[PDB]
């Protein structure tokens, strides 16, 4: 943290943040969501980290170089240490990326190594080669070298993600799946795990061995698992919570902006809200059915009438303001909603549905007041505009992600937030074989368009191919785009250090401080 001259600090430097739900895990190779990544950034530190404005910056690596965008060499700082006092070395990174790649780990982010194109990843994921064949090596204790199968100019931008953070081999091997318990865990970020009570709280405390510990100010941070956005706001205003989660309640948001405007933070955010269709299950394997659902949803009503928080109506998966995005707005987005409705009813009529034998299916969402209200509105709109019936179902966060990976569903609420600011952070998740692909979408034409983006050494061709890939996804109606997010949350006046400028929202509690009050 960089405390401004003249600022008076509180005697007690403690922070309480709401985290939306109970995390899937604290193991960097077993996580996939926002709540999980929020705690991971405080505990495990990879090669690079985001600074307070979101720029890729030095983490364990203090400097790095590349040869032809294919061989990347990272120089690790000599004083990087784990919470037990042992040095962080290049051997820790070799072990960790191999564990991520190994199919026996079954990481939801195994494909992150495919996105960065590390040598031999496809064969390792398929079981044809051992994980020790991965294109990474330690040249010495402080030098980590990565080899790619093709030139990737933006490779270093990927390295702030939790999936490529180091894990402690000795704890993993001795305790197996219990390595993350407080008595066994070892961490290398600014904080250490103090307490963990499932469905109550996660408490972290300063790690005195962290290399940049002299600049850390907050001594303790608590993360809570509150899924009701109303309850989060209530406990913030009562004084218990210093920072809410970034999901705001429809019941109170308008009033909050009038009552405490300076505490209501609303900033740009690279995420898309959509309804994920299970593309491999009838009758959702029929493009006429997917297209009807996509067109019949009224984005103006949802965005401006129901939520009214500043989100923008969506027509694509990748947000149009992503660095490198130059997307073409589909002609169906320009029509009236009436014209969209007629096209949708005609398509369902062609697919065999009638008044006596309508289309009926499930709409799954993760427990939340906001997602429930949005799903109710969508159900009503689809009933009125298209004559379809839906059954809403809620599931806890960890269970919800598992259901989507299994294909245990019909249609599901969904969000995707960028891991790095480049269109492939989104597009790579729709590749036929991606570990992040919960749409269960497989298109040879889509896969080829993305493969061609790193076969050219040019950005205009690259951006044009990304636009064509979005057109292919839209043509097939793989998903139902709803809105591009704004990042809305409440932050007390005494919490310093949060700029609102990072469009990925990669906060580190080591950068915050409590002003005397
Ligand atoms: N990109 C993921 C994490 C973003 C925080 C780290 N930058 C993300 O959006 N995860 C999703 C769940 C993934 C579902 C699989 N398709 C989320 O948190 O909703
Ligand atoms: O404040 U004693
Ligand atoms: O000194 U007093 O919260
Ligand atoms: O690396 U260039 O355009
Ligand atoms: O590698 U360039 O802007
Ligand atoms: O900031 U740019 O590619
Ligand atoms: O409808 U049903 O699974
Ligand atoms: O609090 U209510 O729906
Ligand atoms: O909490 U008083 O000064």
UniProtKB/Swiss-Prot annotation:
Keywords: Disulfide bond, Peptide transport, Periplasm, Protein transport, Signal, Transport. It is found in: Periplasm. GO terms for biological process: peptide transport; protein transport. PROSITE patterns: SBP_BACTERIAL_5 (PS01040). Induction: Part of the opp operon, which is constitutively expressed. Disruption phenotype: Mutant cannot take up cell wall peptides. Coiled coil: none annotated. GO terms for molecular function: peptide transmembrane transporter activity. InterPro entries: Peptide/Ni-bd, SBP_5, SBP_5_CS, SBP_5_dom. GO terms for cellular component: ATP-binding cassette (ABC) transporter complex; outer membrane-bounded periplasmic space. Disulfide bonds join 271-417. Belongs to the bacterial solute-binding protein 5 family. Part of the ABC transporter complex OppABCDF involved in the uptake of oligopeptides, including the cell wall murein tripeptide L-alanyl-gamma-D-glutamyl-meso-diaminopimelate. Plays an important nutritional role and is involved in the recycling of cell wall peptides. Binds peptides containing from two to five amino acid residues regardless of their sequence. Also binds cell wall peptides, such as L-alanyl-gamma-D-glutamyl-meso-diaminopimelate. Accommodates the ligand side chains in large hydrated pockets which impose little specificity on binding. Tight binding is achieved by utilising the hydrogen-bonding potential of the main chain of the ligand. The complex is composed of two ATP-binding proteins (OppD and OppF), two transmembrane proteins (OppB and OppC) and a solute-binding protein (OppA). Isothermal titration calorimetric measurements of the binding of lysine-containing peptides of different lengths to OppA show that the dipeptide Lys-Lys is bound with 60-fold lower affinity than related tri- and tetrapeptides (Lys-Lys-Lys and Lys-Lys-Lys-Ala, respectively). This is Periplasmic oligopeptide-binding protein OppA. It comes from Salmonella typhimurium (strain LT2 / SGSC1412 / ATCC 700720).
